[PDB]
Amino acid sequence: DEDETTALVCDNGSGLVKAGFAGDDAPRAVFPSIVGRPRHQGVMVGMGQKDSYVGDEAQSKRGILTLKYPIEHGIITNWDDMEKIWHHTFYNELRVAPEEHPTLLTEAPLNPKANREKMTQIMFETFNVPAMYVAIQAVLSLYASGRTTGIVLDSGDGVTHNVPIYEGYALPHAIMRLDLAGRDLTDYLMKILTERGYSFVTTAEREIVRDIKEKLCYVALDFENEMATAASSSSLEKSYELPDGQVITIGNERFRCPETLFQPSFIGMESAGIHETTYNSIMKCDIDIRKDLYANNVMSGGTTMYPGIADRMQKEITALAPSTMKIKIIAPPERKYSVWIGGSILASLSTFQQMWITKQEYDEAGPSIVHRKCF
Amino acid sequence: DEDETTALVCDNGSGLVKAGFAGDDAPRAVFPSIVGRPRHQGVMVGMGQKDSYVGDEAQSKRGILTLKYPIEHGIITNWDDMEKIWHHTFYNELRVAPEEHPTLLTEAPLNPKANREKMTQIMFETFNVPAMYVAIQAVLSLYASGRTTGIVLDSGDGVTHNVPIYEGYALPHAIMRLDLAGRDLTDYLMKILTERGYSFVTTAEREIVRDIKEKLCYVALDFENEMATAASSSSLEKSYELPDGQVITIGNERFRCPETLFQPSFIGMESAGIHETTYNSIMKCDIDIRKDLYANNVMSGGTTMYPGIADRMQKEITALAPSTMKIKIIAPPERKYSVWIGGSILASLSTFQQMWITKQEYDEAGPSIVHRKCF
Amino acid sequence: ISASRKLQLKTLLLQIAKQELEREAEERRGEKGRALSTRCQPLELAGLGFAELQDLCRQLHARVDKVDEERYDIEAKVTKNITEIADLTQKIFDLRGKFKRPTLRRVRISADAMMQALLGARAKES
Amino acid sequence: DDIYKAAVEQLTEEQKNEFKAAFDIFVLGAEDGCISTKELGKVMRMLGQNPTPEELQEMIDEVDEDGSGTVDFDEFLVMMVRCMKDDSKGKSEEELSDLFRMFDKNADGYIDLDELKIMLQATGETITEDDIEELMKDGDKNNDGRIDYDEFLEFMKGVE
Amino acid sequence: ILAERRKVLAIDHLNEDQLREKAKELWQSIYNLEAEKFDLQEKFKQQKYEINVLRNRINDNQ
């Protein structure tokens, strides 16, 4: 498949792992961070079957499997399951592996340090990677976006980081990390769809409601006006096809789920929302920085695919921001993929070739080396 | 590169550096006397980024830099930083290498040796200038001002010189080094604006207050009636736009700051202020000199640009001065730029071509030569 | 144009441009090697007196020292302008380049290679 | 355009006939006598495929220099044939800079006309002042009759 | 650095062959440094040239 020892890049979240090789501007394939296991007793023999299923296998045979996610809020809690997902990712589907390629991982600036230590150990001892680097997701978003400055809202599956970067430098005192992400938005949606008579509890159901959110939901520039009509008229409803031929018809729930980004109180979180959070990352920086961060609100990660997000965010920040000042938002089509893409850019940059931890330095220092060599 | 091997002239104060070539009527460029350094950890790679920035680079990139001034109340204490500012000045804005041209630098004679010795050494050893000359600020100001007789009030960023000159001669016993300057006026304003609810404590904030002072402040010939009204009415407040779009209004504080020059107790200084110091320099001169200095008080340097300052000084001196006599102030538009203009004039005089230290005499004698050849 | 004229042109053109660099350079390195053989001239030997000989050893020695210093200065300034090439280059290039790395597509794999991987032995004259 | 003609100076035409054979094998897939957007789709999902859509929409709108507006038959053919790699020497930065020295003989980073004219005249082949008109449009991206180097670069980068 | 830009100068105890060796090995080492001088001038010539370019693009940007 490949004729060069290019670095490999993997963006591993509580949703899916985006993966491919450096030099591309997209992952080669997406690998859901899922390990599936049968929840039923087998009766027939000569049926093939797996002890455990991963990624797309886990989703394809999900009718009788319970599906578990090894990553919680950016932390791998079950790395034995991640090794199976990674083995499949590398050797079966991407047809590349760390064994013959250096590997770049994507992470948040405040991701618990022990999590990088374990991923570092796995790629060096299980997959025999010749070298490693763990990069900041905000950096990767800025490279993909064509910027050196901005507030990056990396919208992960289990956590949003929110870190300001100026002239290529971190401004860590203004990080406003929030325990709200795409997976929590799904929880709100399933609770309100439960109120309508469509409970989502078991694995197949959990996957369906996630799929409903991704295809039907939006934020809109004005929640209250959107609701005044959506709560009053069937013209704002959409019927989603469930796997068995039945449908679910969804009204203002279509936007109330996404709205949790602006209203975290919807899921019990003590927060004013992502626009206030973005505002504080800008406002807590020095006034000669603030102008450049107001001009560079960078949306990245997932949930940014919701219609109206660019307008909802720019308008709320403008309202919070001082007058005269111009507030601008970056929301490129390289959305949801921009962290992976930035990983490709960074791994391949000539300026980054000396930033790699080799599998020499690794064994002399051990896995904790990532804490000194990467960030 | 020029049409003559003209001297280059650089007027390096504690505030700003004015530079151009001898024979012009203006500096070609002005730089802050600043060397800036990043106070943040880089996150992105391949971002360029200097160890230090100088002059206008230091100010343009200041959002994350600490900004230091190599000159302390007229004395260079950091000559590595001044060498970098000078290289930038000479090669990037003037576009002339000193190796082919004599260079004239300026200082008060009150300066405790190190400044003229190091200024001479930097130009001879790091720039290989063929010749050097360290000039007197009072001399330069009087040439620029059209005088041979009078008192130079150069109340700029560092120190006030207040040196009297008669028929081109110094009257050194009457020179009063005064620790009251534009830099102290800025610090005072930062503190009183803090009282109003707009704290200014960081580098960016210090630069903002200096900009506020330069654009909004005035002294007033009658500060008492001016504050009786300014402290009572919003109708005398002037709005200033802060870099992030926020607005600060300043009332009696606008003049309260400049007033320090006449009320030095505002910054904890045991002094009579600039009007009495000027008066005492006149008084200390012989009785047949006093009358010529009373009639010729000459403004130079900075802070002499405040509205009401020429009138404030002339009236305060008149009040201290004897009757019959006419007390007068000369306040040319060559204000603040007058030392540089004088440098252009002096460097070019035929009667000053024997005053230059050659790059022969320098090496035979060493930098202590400045004490035998310049003044 | 039907411009094989243009192809052999531009090879010949980049040729002649490097060739004007090269005539520039023939002049330059003439001066170079000329100054080499002279600046230390193969010296003359027969019959001389010993004191003068040690004087000349010391002389050529201090000449090493001095010529060293001097070319080192040419270096240091060359180096300053080299850093300047780095910096003007890099930093104007910041004002002035940096996606010169294009959309670096690896689908621009060895295209002949993936081709052949999909075609076989039908690729022999090229 | 010109490149087409040089490369056909490499080899001969009977080759092209057997190409046409290969293509009767392929030529299934013109919606419009062209191989345009839907044809890209059709002949590429022939195997369930389509080019990296940068390539694809690129062919759709952009590489239309002429105002073809679309992937012609010619343009889909263009991608499918520019497949096998053969360009020579693509001359560029360090080349073009050392060149720029005598280009900008001015020693200034801004070429004048006749240094380039000399280089043109001494290449080894034909200088159409048509093409010199081209080059003034191109080289001096400033088009101020004097060329900073990178202007001349992109004016000369990437060609034999 | 001044004091040591000189190599070691050995012309005291040995006979005449090593004496001429000393002088002329100095000669050729000079000779070399002479080269480096000329050619760093040359490099600086093309250097100021391509930096004529560089300052041009400076202007083109500033």
Q: Domain holding A56: CATH number? A: 2.30.36.70
Domain enclosing residue A241, as ranges: 182-267
Name every chain C residue with its beta carbon within 8 A of the beta carbon of A6.
106
Instruction: Output b/e per residue, A259-290; b: 16+ Cβ within 10 A.
Output: bbbbbbebeeeebbbbbbbbbbbbbbbbbbbb
User: Are the CB atoms for E16 and C50 separated by under 8 Å?
Assistant: yes
H helical segments located in B217-308: 223-230, 253-256, 274-283, 287-294
Q: Are residues B9 and B104 in the same domain?
A: yes
Q: Are residues B19 and B120 in the same domain?
A: yes
Q: Which of A134, A154, A167, A375 is the best substitution to test chain B (most B C-beta atoms within 10 A)?
A: A167
DSSP 3-state assignment of B160? strand
Phi, psi of B9 (to 5 degrees): -125, 125
Mutual orientation of helices D37-45 and D73-81 as an angle, nearest 10°?
50
Q: Looking at the DSSP assignment, which residues form a beta bridge with residue A150?
A: A165
Pairing of strands B35-38, B53-54: antiparallel
Pairing of strands B65-68, B71-72: unpaired
- How far CA B184 is from CA of B15, B238, B261, in Å, comes to 12, 22, 9
Q: Which of C26, C29, C50, C63 is the best substitution to test chain E (most E C-beta atoms within 10 A)?
A: C63
Q: Which of E20, E23, E33 lies at the smallest CB-CB distance from C68?
A: E33
Phi, psi of C84 (to 5 degrees): -70, -40
Q: List the A16-21 sheet strands across, edge first.
A: A29-32, A16-21, A8-12, A103-107, A131-136, A357-358
User: Which residue is listed with tokens 């000359």?
Assistant: B133
User: Which residue is listed with tokens 């002037």?
Assistant: B238
Residues 6 or more apart whose Cβ sits within 8 Å of residue A371: A113, A116, A117
Pick the closest to residue D113 from D97, D129, D125 (CA basis): D129
Contacts of A among chains (3+ CB pairs under 8 A): B, C
In angstroms, the CA A23 to CA A21 distance is: 6
Q: Looking at the DSSP assignment, which residues form a beta bridge with residue B12?
A: B17
In angstroms, the CA B343 to CA B203 distance is: 31
Give the CA-trace dihedral at C4, C7, C10, C15, to 10 degrees: -100
- As a whole number of angstroms, the longest Cα–Cα distance in chain A is 73
Pick the closest to residue A2 from A23, A32, A31 (CA basis): A23
Residue type, D151: E
Phi, psi of C70 (to 5 degrees): -70, -55
In angstroms, the CA A58 to CA A35 distance is: 6
Q: Are residues A22 and A88 in the same domain?
A: yes
User: Are the CB atoms for A306 and A182 separated by under 8 Å?
Assistant: no
- Which among B267, B291, B313 is the end of a domain? B267
User: Strand locations in B296-338, DSSP E?
Assistant: 297-299, 329-330
- H/E stretch holding E30 reads helix E16-61
Pick the closest to residue A33 from A15, A51, A45 (CA basis): A15
Instruction: Output b/e per residue, D86-114; b: 16+ Cβ within 10 A.
Output: eeeeebbeebbbbbbbbbbbbebbbbeee
- H/E stretch holding A34 reads none
Would you give the DSSP letter of residue A18?
Answer: E
Phi, psi of A37 (to 5 degrees): -140, 140
Name every chain C residue with its beta carbon within 8 A of the beta carbon of B48.
87, 90-91, 94
Work out the number of other CB atoms within 10 angstroms of the CB of residue C124. Answer: 5
Q: Are residues B205 and B324 in the same domain?
A: no
Q: How many CB pairs under 8 A join C and E?
A: 140
Check CB contact under 8 Å for B61 and A346: no
Work out the number of other CB atoms within 10 angstroms of the CB of residue B115. Answer: 24
Check CB contact under 8 Å for C109 and A3: yes
- As a whole number of angstroms, the longest Cα–Cα distance in chain E is 66
First to last CA, chain E: 40
Q: Are residues B114 and B24 in the same domain?
A: yes
Name every chain C residue with its beta carbon within 8 A of the beta carbon of E16.
50, 53
Residue type, B248: I
Q: Are residues A8 and A48 in the same domain?
A: no
In angstroms, the CA A357 to CA A133 distance is: 6
Q: Are residues B177 and B187 in the same domain?
A: no
User: Are the CB atoms for B96 and B86 separated by under 8 Å?
Assistant: no
- H/E stretch holding A236 reads none
Q: Are residues B294 and B194 in the same domain?
A: no
Name every chain A residue with its beta carbon within 8 A of the beta carbon of C110.
3
- Which among A13, A45, A68 is the end of a domain? A68
Smallest CA–CA separation between B37 and chain A, in Å? 13
Pick the closest to residue B103 from B88, B86, B115 (CA basis): B86
In angstroms, the CA B297 to CA B291 distance is: 11
The torsion region of residue B36 among left (phi > 0), alpha (psi -120 to 50) and beta comes to: beta
Name every chain A residue with its beta carbon within 8 A of the beta carbon of C106.
6, 21, 23-24
Contacts of C among chains (3+ CB pairs under 8 A): A, B, D, E
Q: ∠ CA C124-C125-C126 to the nearest 5 degrees?
A: 85
Would you give the DSSP letter of residue A325?
Answer: P
- Which among A52, A68, A84 is the end of a domain? A68
User: Which residue is listed with tokens 């000199």?
Assistant: B289
Q: Are residues A26 and A105 in the same domain?
A: yes
Name every chain A residue with its beta carbon within 8 A of the beta carbon of C109.
2-3
User: Are the CB atoms for A86 and A70 separated by under 8 Å?
Assistant: no
Q: Are residues B100 and B208 in the same domain?
A: no
Check CB contact under 8 Å for E33 and C82: no
CA–chain centroid gap for C92, Å, is: 23
Residues in chain E: 62
Q: Are residues A48 and A104 in the same domain?
A: no
Pick the closest to residue A150 from A298, A48, A41 (CA basis): A298
Residue type, A314: Q
Check CB contact under 8 Å for C105 and D52: yes
Q: Are residues A124 and A222 in the same domain?
A: no
Residue type, E51: I
Do C and A make contact, counting contact as 3+ CB pairs within 8 angstroms? yes
Work out the number of other CB atoms within 10 angstroms of the CB of residue A162. Answer: 23
The CATH number linked to B285 is 3.30.420.40
In angstroms, the CA A178 to CA C13 distance is: 61
Give the total number of structural domains in chain B: 4
